[PDB]
Design a binder for this molecule. Structure first.
Ligand SMILES: COc1cc([C@@H](CC(=O)O)c2ccc(C)c(CN3CCOc4ccccc4S3(=O)=O)c2)cc2nnn(C)c12
Ligand SMILES: [Cl-]
Length: 290
């Protein structure tokens, strides 16, 4: 059975509870069980075929509540189940999975911009802090390559960042890597082949269409073809060797545009529209439901 791209949550006028799944094999969207609590600025990931929604904030007519929540969606049952909450609320979070564990990276709680990082063990339903990043980062992009965790760009409370760093699990240690050529907060960050991609983002002045990638072997960042749309706070994932970017904000519109990147041709193509424009979604890929 094929795999779908799931988008959870996001923001349009207020934080959203939508869970919808796109099937690249046939172009279809399915609306699935809503999140129990609306949330924007969350991240999605998958472990053991389960979809997890991590952190965010409920920006609603009746207030703004940063989320420490971890919730688990089972495609086999179409149900959300609460898991243990994180140590702290983390809005505009990034996450990465290594060796079946979820790393929650940075994000904000009110005016607190976190450098802290914590790790979730599904088999124990427990979170534990690990070493903090060298830098406070909200709107941080996170990717995993070769069982190493990367935190890329973001906003430290004062400046948006071109900096990036790498976490070495067996040393419980963060070290800076080569900075990007572009300042990016709320970029989409993912991995494809031996490269970390950083797509779009916000630099304090503009939403960006540029895309660059870090080759871990050469330790250098290189720009590739820009996206068709400028976008910050986009969702990003990889499905069958291609990068998909979903939604985001372009300084004018909350985008419904979904674009995909073919690395072999260095081209971006429009592939579908989300059912409604939105930014700050969580995105991941897993099996079709039921
Ligand atoms: C301060 O303005 C901005 C901040 C960010 C950054 C944070 C920063 O650099 O200060 C950012 C990064 C990541 C995420 C998820 C967000 C929040 N989302 C985008 C903004 O839209 C809203 C608005 C209200 C609630 C939630 C959202 S969001 O879609 O979750 C911001 C991105 C922007 N893009 N355009 N503008 C005007 C931006
Ligand atoms: Cl926000």
């Amino acid at each position: 059975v094929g795999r779908l791209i799931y988008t959870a949550g996001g923001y349009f006028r207020q934080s959203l509870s939508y869970l919808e799944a796109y099937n690249p094999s046939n172009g279809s969207w399915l609306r699935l069980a809503d999140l129990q609590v609306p949330r924007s600025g969350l991240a999605g990931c998958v472990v053991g075929g389960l979809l997890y929604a991590v952190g965010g904030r409920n920006n609603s007519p009746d207030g703004n509540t940063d989320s420490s929540a971890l919730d688990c969606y089972n495609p086999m049952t179409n149900q959300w189940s609460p898991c243990a909450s994180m140590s702290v609320p983390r809005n505009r979070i990034g996450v990465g999975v290594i060796d079946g564990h979820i790393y929650a990276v940075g994000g904000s709680h009110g005016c607190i911009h976190h450098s802290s990082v914590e790790r979730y063990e599904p088999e124990r339903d427990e979170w534990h802090l690990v070493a903090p990043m060298l830098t406070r980062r909200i709107g941080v992009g996170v990717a995993v390559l070769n069982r190493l965790l990367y935190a890329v760009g973001g906003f430290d409370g004062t400046n948006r960042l071109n900096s990036a760093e790498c976490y070495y699990p067996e040393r419980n240690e963060w070290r800076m890597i080569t900075p990007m050529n572009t300042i990016r907060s709320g970029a989409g960050v993912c991995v494809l082949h031996n490269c970390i991609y950083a797509a779009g983002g916000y630099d304090g002045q503009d939403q960006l269409n540029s895309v660059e990638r870090y080759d871990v072997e050469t330790e250098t960042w290189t720009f590739v073809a820009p996206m068709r749309h400028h976008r910050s706070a986009l969702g990003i994932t990889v499905h069958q060797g291609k990068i998909y970017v979903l939604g985001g904000y372009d300084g004018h519109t909350f985008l419904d545009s979904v674009e995909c990147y073919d690395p072999d041709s260095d081209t971006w193509s429009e592939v579908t529209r989300m059912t409604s424009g939105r930014s700050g979604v969580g995105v991941a890929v897993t099996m079709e439901p039921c």
